[PDB]
Amino acid sequence: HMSLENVAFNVVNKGHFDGQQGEVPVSIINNTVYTKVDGVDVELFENKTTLPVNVAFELWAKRNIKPVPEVKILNNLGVDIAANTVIWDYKRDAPAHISTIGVCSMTDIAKKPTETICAPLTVFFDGRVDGQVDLFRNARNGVLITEGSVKGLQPSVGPKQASLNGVTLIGEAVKTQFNYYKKVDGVVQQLPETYFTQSRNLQEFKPRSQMEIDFLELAMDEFIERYKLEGYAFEHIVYGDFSHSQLGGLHLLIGLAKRFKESPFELQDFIPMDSTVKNYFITDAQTGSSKCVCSVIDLLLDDFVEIIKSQDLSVVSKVVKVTIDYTEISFMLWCKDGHVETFYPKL
Amino acid sequence: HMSLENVAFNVVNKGHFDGQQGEVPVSIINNTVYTKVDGVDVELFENKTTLPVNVAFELWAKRNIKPVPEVKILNNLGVDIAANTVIWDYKRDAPAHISTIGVCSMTDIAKKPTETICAPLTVFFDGRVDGQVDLFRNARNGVLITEGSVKGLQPSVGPKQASLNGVTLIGEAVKTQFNYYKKVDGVVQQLPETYFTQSRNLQEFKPRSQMEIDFLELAMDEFIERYKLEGYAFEHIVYGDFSHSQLGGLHLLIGLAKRFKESPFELQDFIPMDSTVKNYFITDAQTGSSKCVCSVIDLLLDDFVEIIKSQDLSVVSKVVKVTIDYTEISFMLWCKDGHVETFYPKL
């Protein structure tokens, strides 16, 4: 019973594909799907993907509408495909994964995740659905999330925030903190201690600690004096230097959020995807200071302090590996006479 | 149960829409409809119409596959729409009529031809289908075809040839000669005495009379002598004059067919539709003689002789009306000292 006209019927009456029977008339013209309502044509969907318009439309209609992990997490853990669902990437207006399992006949490589073809792929399993936990046992490579514990397996506690219909949030009407589990070539693996990025916007930026509130409210000199941060180059690294043509430092998102209230500036996101580290092309409207590639990360300031304070300030240059969002980020550390010059994410 | 995937299923298994249940996967990319067969994508339809790709695809799939009248006839009689079918125009690779009655939800203006919306339109009715003759009786404006007689109604005998899946032919396994009837504002109308064009090609041209066979086989002077055509300017009108830069005359298709065997030339069909009269841009490869607008018609030579023989050669200029394919064509006749100079279809 699967058809274009049926998919559209569901979208019109329910907002997403809900397995309802019915049809409505449809027009396809130039990567857009229209339908007729009271004699006039109405835009339902504009294809921004590399898939065919009608295939993309169907995958969108069947997108997951419960809280799910942010795509950067799933990428960091090496997830190749999802089991009997679709993770819509709202930053690319596209599917997170281009192949499917038991969802859409045009994109399916299999009907069930146990088929031989799936063995070499790392499959995503949602423990909230019935039968998925057992499929995760029996699977050769995979990733599993659950709300509660699963006896037999050691959990890793994930981040507090998740994505719900494109909105990243910390749920209180719904649970957004998951237990993570992973398997490689038939063997369960221990996940390392990790920090997590906070996934915040620049315009609707909110603090999440007393230190963050102090940072936003206080002046520069006062903040450094309290919390005793002399020699750690917060002037350069967090606050940022706008005195020369080349913009200096400015690698923590909170730093941008402070500057933005006082004096708006221009960001170009020339690689628009979800990442643990982001690169922006930044031009400061007040000064005319700019930089082509500016590496930015959103750590809780408290955690950034913890990371920098636990380093050796004796060496001139050093690469520092740190586990964030379940992956190794490299940082470059420069010191001079026992204080820091700079400390930034490597390219 | 109307759907894209179902329409395609029928096309794949039956060649046209035959009301079968089933689905196959489909892709839409750039005005083309594809389907997957043994893992690979296959072109089913390329849209050359002004309709949306999926709408056009459906109308094509539901095209009429019995012998039907050539579009030029239907146009000449003033048919605006067809009742519960689709007449595909194979010269335009498009529908003959852009609106429908009980065929496709996107293009339908009504479900039945008796609805009030249909009253001002001239509807086509096919007497071979059950109930159509009665619908023709109740209709305000319409055209009807039948194989046999219909009690009460005076018939007009149509042409011998009809179109079958794009092929124009005189049927012997099937009947292609119809009785025609027409109504205007509730009143049956008498259709006039008419000639019919022969609908022949230039490359596969075949004669249909002894006179036509003689024309092709014999030399010019001999043909004019035998059928006594002195003073009727067949040298100019039919055979054509290639001695000057501007090509002279050449208005009968048989004339082209004779020339083409001896010495091929170039036609440009700059308005590609079916018409009783055609205009071509012609360049003669042998001489370099040419003409921008060359009006051509395909009458049976016998009929052309009959028409020209029954004229008054006393006037210098005269417009001559002649009924061909149920419509009035004007001809321009020039005479000088009791013989003809030229005689051609008016522009």
**What does A187-254 look like in DSSP terms, one character per residue?**
EEEPPPP-B------SSS----SHHHHHHHHS-HHHHHHTTT-TTS-HIIIII-B-SSSB-B---BHH
Q: Which residues does B283 contact at the CB level (< 8 Å), separation at least 6?
A: B265, B266, B290
Helix, strand, coil % in chain A, rounded to nearest 5 = 20, 30, 50
**B271/A154 Cα distance (integer angstroms):** 77
**CB of B139 closer than 8 Å to CB of B98:** no
- Token pair in block for residue A134: 């057992």
**B183/B156 Cα distance (integer angstroms):** 13
**A201/B327 Cα distance (integer angstroms):** 73
DSSP letter for each residue of B54-108: HHHHHHHHT---S-B--HHHHHHTT--EESSS--EETTTTEES-S-EESS-TTTE
**CB of B184 closer than 8 Å to CB of B143:** no
Residues of B noted as catalytic: 236, 251, 291
**CB of B146 closer than 8 Å to CB of B132:** no
**B45/B35 Cα distance (integer angstroms):** 10
Which has the closest alpha carbon to B147: B136, B133, B163, B167?
B133
**B344/B332 Cα distance (integer angstroms):** 5
SS3 B117: helix
**CB of B279 closer than 8 Å to CB of B297:** no
Whether residues A106 and B29 touch (CB distance < 8 A) is answered with: no
Distance from B127 to chain A by nearest Cα, in Å? 31
**CB of B133 closer than 8 Å to CB of B144:** yes
Please indicate if any CB of chain B lies within 8 Å of the CB of A189. no
- Token pair in block for residue A92: 């690319």
**B122/A215 Cα distance (integer angstroms):** 80
**B306/B329 Cα distance (integer angstroms):** 16
**CB of A162 closer than 8 Å to CB of A176:** yes
SS3 A93: coil
Q: Name the CA radius of gyration of chain A, rounded.
A: 24
**B278/B283 Cα distance (integer angstroms):** 16
Q: Specify the long-range contacts of residues B182-187, CB closer than 8 Å, at least 24 apart.
A: B182/B77, B182/B142, B182/B143, B182/B144, B183/B136, B183/B139, B183/B140, B183/B141, B183/B142, B183/B143, B184/B141, B185/B140, B185/B141, B186/B140
Please indicate if any CB of chain B lies within 8 Å of the CB of A3. yes
Within 10 Å of residue A268's Cβ, how many Cβ atoms? 13
Residue A151 has, within 13 A of its CA and on its CB side, a CA count of 0
- Token pair in block for residue B92: 């335009």
Nearest to A4 among B1, B4, B106 (CB): B4
- The torsion defined by the Cα of A99, A100, A104 and A107, in degrees rounded to 10, comes to 20
**A171/A158 Cα distance (integer angstroms):** 14
Q: Work out the widest C-alpha separation in chain A, in whole angstroms.
A: 77
Encode burial over A188-211: b for 16+ CB neighbours within 10 A, e otherwise: eeebeebbbbbbbebeebebeeeb
Please indicate if any CB of chain A lies within 8 Å of the CB of B28. yes
**A15/A68 Cα distance (integer angstroms):** 19
**A291/A284 Cα distance (integer angstroms):** 9
Which has the closest alpha carbon to A108: A173, A59, A174?
A59
**A3/A16 Cα distance (integer angstroms):** 14
**A48/A57 Cα distance (integer angstroms):** 10
**B27/A107 Cα distance (integer angstroms):** 11
Active site residue A111: no
**Helix A210-217 and helix A301-309, axial crossing angle in degrees, nearest 10:** 100
Flag whether A11 is marked binding: no
**A220/B9 Cα distance (integer angstroms):** 70
DSSP letter for each residue of B247-262: -B---BHHHHHHHHHH
Residue B320 has, within 13 A of its CA and on its CB side, a CA count of 21
Helix, strand, coil % in chain B, rounded to nearest 5 = 20, 30, 50
- Token pair in block for residue A245: 């043509």
Please indicate if any CB of chain A lies within 8 Å of the CB of B105. yes
**CB of A104 closer than 8 Å to CB of A58:** yes
DSSP letter for each residue of A96-155: S-S-EESS-TTTEEESSTTSGGGTTS-EEEETTSTTHHHHHTT-SSEEEEESS--TTS--
The H or E element spanning position A59 is: helix A53-61
- Token pair in block for residue A288: 């005319």
SS3 A10: helix
SS3 B41: strand
Within 10 Å of residue A118's Cβ, how many Cβ atoms? 22
Instruction: State the method.
Output: X-ray
**CB of A183 closer than 8 Å to CB of A154:** no
Residue B244 has, within 13 A of its CA and on its CB side, a CA count of 8
Which has the closest alpha carbon to A277: A307, A256, A298, A308?
A298
**A70/A87 Cα distance (integer angstroms):** 9
Q: Which residues does B45 contact at the CB level (< 8 Å), separation at least 6?
A: B11, B32, B33, B53, B56, B57, B60
Q: Which residues does A130 contact at the CB level (< 8 Å), separation at least 6?
A: none
Please indicate if any CB of chain B lies within 8 Å of the CB of A25. yes
Structural gaps in chain B: residues followed by a C–N separation over 2.5 Å:
none
A108-110 vs A100-101, strand pairing mode: parallel
Domains and CATH numbers, chain A: 1-51 (3.30.160.820), 63-189 (3.40.50.11580), 210-345 (no CATH)
**B134/B132 Cα distance (integer angstroms):** 5
| Amino acid identity, position B94 | A
**Helix B210-217 and helix B301-309, axial crossing angle in degrees, nearest 10:** 100
A:54-83 residues touching chain B, CB 8 A cutoff = 54-55
DSSP letter for each residue of B129-159: STTHHHHHHH-SSEEEEESS--TT---EE--
**Residues of chain A contacting B29 with CB distance shorter than 8 Å:** 52-53
**Residues of chain A contacting B26 with CB distance shorter than 8 Å:** 4, 54, 106
Nearest to A27 among B5, B6, B55 (CB): B55
**A245/A223 Cα distance (integer angstroms):** 27
Kindly report the CA angle at A343 between A342 and A347, in degrees rounded to 5?
Answer: 115
**A213/A210 Cα distance (integer angstroms):** 5
**B227/B236 Cα distance (integer angstroms):** 17
**B260/B266 Cα distance (integer angstroms):** 10
- Residue B60 φ/ψ region, left for φ over 0, alpha for ψ in the -120 to 50 degree band, beta for the rest: alpha
| Amino acid identity, position A238 | V
Please indicate if any CB of chain B lies within 8 Å of the CB of A31. no
Nearest to B52 among A2, A29, A52 (CB): A29
Q: Exposed, middle or buried by CB within 10 Å (0-12, 13-18, 19+), for B164? A: middle
Please indicate if any CB of chain B lies within 8 Å of the CB of A22. no
SS3 B127: coil
Distance from A96 to chain B by nearest Cα, in Å? 20
**CB of A334 closer than 8 Å to CB of A206:** no
B12 phi, psi to nearest 5 deg: -65, -40
The H or E element spanning position B183 is: strand B179-184
Distance from A276 to chain B by nearest Cα, in Å? 35
* Residue position matching structure tokens 């950034």: A304
Best residue in B2, B5, B53 for a mutation probing chain A (most A CBs within 10 Å): B5
Please indicate if any CB of chain A lies within 8 Å of the CB of B117. no
**Residues of chain B contacting A6 with CB distance shorter than 8 Å:** 3
Which has the closest alpha carbon to B83: B37, B136, B46?
B136
**B332/B347 Cα distance (integer angstroms):** 9
**CB of B243 closer than 8 Å to CB of B289:** yes
Within 10 Å of residue B41's Cβ, how many Cβ atoms? 16
Distance from A21 to chain B by nearest Cα, in Å? 10
B185 phi, psi to nearest 5 deg: 45, 50
- Token pair in block for residue B155: 């018939």
Q: Name the CA radius of gyration of chain B, rounded.
A: 24
Best residue in A4, A9, A10, A28 for a mutation probing chain B (most B CBs within 10 Å): A28
Q: Which residues does B320 contact at the CB level (< 8 Å), separation at least 6?
A: B311, B330, B331, B332, B333, B343
